[PDB]
């Protein structure tokens, strides 16, 4: 939630997608790596699980 | 003929815009044909020739010509004495078959200027102005009330043109519609089964369907025939609602009586002996 609060604040406060990546909450994944990950469709499924 | 019924009228409600009424004891074909006249056959005045002197605006010329034709025009006092263009002896135009409008605007101001219906002036006497802002004391008057923003202009643009409005009727172009809309409804409880409802409980009841107030929904009667048609004619504003109805019926009378004269013309010229 704090990251989302920064994105809403981004409307005037300095912030970027790059900051969001530097937090290490999001990553880039290519098709070769994508073969070995265990990727889940929605937070819903990953929690309800 | 003895089998012609006297129908009957009742006006439920009247406003500056709407006219809402019931016709009873008549035929559907009459109701439907009369609804069609309200659209197509009732004549009115709208811009028909646009001559563009100068146009520096960000809208192309034919676009200005389009918006401009479509704007509404009062006609009630004058739509009758005016004659049709093609019928008129004059070459091109004249005071007797058309009325002239002039528009001249330029943006000399730093703030964006709007071009509106009031800025359009009738060279013809103010018997036939644009719809909005004249004799006013109108509670419909809100903010700008320009009736139509013909275009917007930034500092430097200018617009000069001439227009000739003419009498014509809706069959020929939609700019000549004398109606905002035309409601038409008959047999609200679906007694006559002209439609067949699958699971009739799933349908709502109109303001005319209140009769049994109950939820019994549609009692059948096969010995019936369509009667008592409900109307709500709504004015575009360019011609007041009752005048639309009275002019429609007269025009229909004129069209019918004329067909009778040609049918008479068949018995007078080329004597009706063919059949």
């Amino acid at each position: 939630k704090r990251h989302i609060d920064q994105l809403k604040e981004r409307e005037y406060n300095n912030y970027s997608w790059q900051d969001l990546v530097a937090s290490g909450v999001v990553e880039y994944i290519d098709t070769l790596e994508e073969e070995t990950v265990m990727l889940a469709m929605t937070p819903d499924d990953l929690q309800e699980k | 003929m003895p089998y012609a019924n006297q129908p009957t009228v009742r006006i439920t409600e009247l406003t500056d815009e709407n006219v809402k009424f019931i016709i009873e004891n008549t035929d559907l074909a009459v109701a439907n044909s009369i609804r069609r006249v309200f659209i197509a056959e009732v004549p009115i005045i709208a811009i028909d020739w646009v001559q563009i002197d100068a146009n520096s605006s960000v809208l192309h010329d034919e676009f200005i010509a389009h918006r401009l034709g479509l704007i509404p025009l009062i006609s009630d006092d004058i739509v009758d004495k005016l004659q049709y263009s093609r019928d008129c002896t004059c070459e091109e135009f004249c005071p007797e078959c058309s009325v002239e409008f002039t528009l001249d605007v330029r943006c000399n101001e730093d703030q964006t200027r709007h071009v509106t219906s009031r800025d359009l002036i009738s060279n013809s006497p103010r018997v036939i102005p644009v719809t909005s802002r004249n004799r006013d004391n109108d509670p419909n008057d809100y903010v700008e009330q320009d009736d139509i923003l013909i275009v917007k202009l930034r500092k430097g643009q200018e617009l000069r043109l001439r227009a000739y409005a003419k009498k014509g009727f809706g069959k020929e172009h939609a700019k000549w519609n004398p109606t905002a809309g035309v409601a038409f409804e008959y047999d609200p409880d679906n007694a006559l089964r002209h439609t067949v409802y699958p699971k009739p409980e799933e349908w709502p009841k109109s303001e005319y369907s209140e009769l049994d107030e109950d939820e019994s929904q549609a009692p059948y009667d096969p010995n019936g025939k369509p009667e008592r048609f409900y109307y709500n004619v709504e004015s575009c504003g360019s011609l007041r609602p009752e005048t639309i109805v009275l002019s429609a019926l007269s025009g229909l009378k004129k069209k019918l009586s004329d067909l009778q004269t040609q049918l008479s013309h068949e018995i007078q010229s080329d004597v009706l002996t063919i059949n």
């Binding site: - | 012609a4 129908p7 406003t15 008549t26 074909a29 009459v30 044909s33 172009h173 049918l263 068949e266």
Partner: protein, 117 residues
């Protein structure tokens, strides 16, 4: 620009008659009327006034094509009354109901309504 001028939908041409009558070759006391430049508005109503009459054996109309302004009205009457007179009466009666409707509407407006003008 292969589109027709819009006035032609309703304006009569100088080389065409408003109405034409032709006899049927099959059955007696039938007749065929051709009405030029006139659509369902006139046609549908004249069909109904003819159906209202008790001596008409058959009445109908057809607009042959959407793109061609013209309708035909075929009528068949009993072996005593002529189809032309039935057509004459059908309009005249229709003129009478509409005049009475216009009269009744106008008087109905004459009710103490205060937005008549």
């Amino acid at each position: 620009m292969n589109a027709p001028p819009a006035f032609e939908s309703f304006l009569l041409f100088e080389g065409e008659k408003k109405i034409t009558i032709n006899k049927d070759t099959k059955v007696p006391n039938a007749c065929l009327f051709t009405i030029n430049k006139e659509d369902h508005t006139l046609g549908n109503i004249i069909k109904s006034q003819l159906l209202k009459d008790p001596q008409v054996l058959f009445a109908g109309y057809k607009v042959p094509h959407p793109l061609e302004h013209k309708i035909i009205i075929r009528v068949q009457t009993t072996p005593d009354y002529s189809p032309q007179e039935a057509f004459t009466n059908a309009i005249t009666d229709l003129i009478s109901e509409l005049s009475l409707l216009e009269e009744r509407f106008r008087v109905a407006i004459k009710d103490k309504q205060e937005g008549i003008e």
